[PDB]
């Protein structure tokens, strides 16, 4: 039976202690962008460099 879960303790050890991992996996060239960063939006400027 394949599962066979972990075993931890408060003082189990630094390696034995659980590093909560969040795998933020990004794809930057997958589709039109839907989520962006927190930047203030300025006024739109036309006909200028």
């Amino acid at each position: 039976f394949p599962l066979q879960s972990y075993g931890f303790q408060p003082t189990n050890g630094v390696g034995y202690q659980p590093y909560r991992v969040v795998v933020l996996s990004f794809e930057l060239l997958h589709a039109p962008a839907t989520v962006c960063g927190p930047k203030k939006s300025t006024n739109l400027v036309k006909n200028k460099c």
Partner: antibody
Amino acid sequence: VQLVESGGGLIQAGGSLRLSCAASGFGVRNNYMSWVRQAPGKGLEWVSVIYSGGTTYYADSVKGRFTISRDNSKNTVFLQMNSLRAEDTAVYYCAREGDVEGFSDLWSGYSRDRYYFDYWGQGTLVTVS
Amino acid sequence: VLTQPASVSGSPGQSITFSCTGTSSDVGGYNYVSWYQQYPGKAPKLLIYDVTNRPSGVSDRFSGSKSGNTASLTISGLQAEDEADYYCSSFTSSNTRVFGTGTKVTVL
């Protein structure tokens, strides 16, 4: 590794019990969780074993009575005792089978078969009276 | 049920060979036999998983073996604390494990 046991007590014939075995340092999932009875001054006649998941393996002489389950939330293996008979009178051990990398033995890689026994608890006396 | 020799008494230092019988279903064919040691009241401790292999914390003089339907223990150099019954656990014989009766050793 520590194993604490409870549930045994003096009951009349045809009663019910609930054997509780809580494991600290390992779970009921890590290694095979066996049930053994050691009759006073006799051998240890194997009763049952709950593996890491989903087993109904029993001995030839105790078929169809013992029911084995776990509450994984509290890490407890339960042996619910119904329809006692004479031969079940013994001291009962919840046995931790030798987990993966048994005593860091330098030959066995992840073969969890390893049908031997690791350290156990203090044992519970289960008496039919 | 594997059969083992009964209670015996002896001298420290030399070798005692305890052979225990079995069936061809478990010992003769399969090779997952293990042996244990217990002190009355305390739970059994592992002596020889796989018989040939020896866990740590155990004196190296303990040695066991299997021959056909029989399993042999070649124990060497007895001492005072060694007086305890020796239990033979073979393979689970198509998922129903079996043991021997027990060999209670005595010393002077």
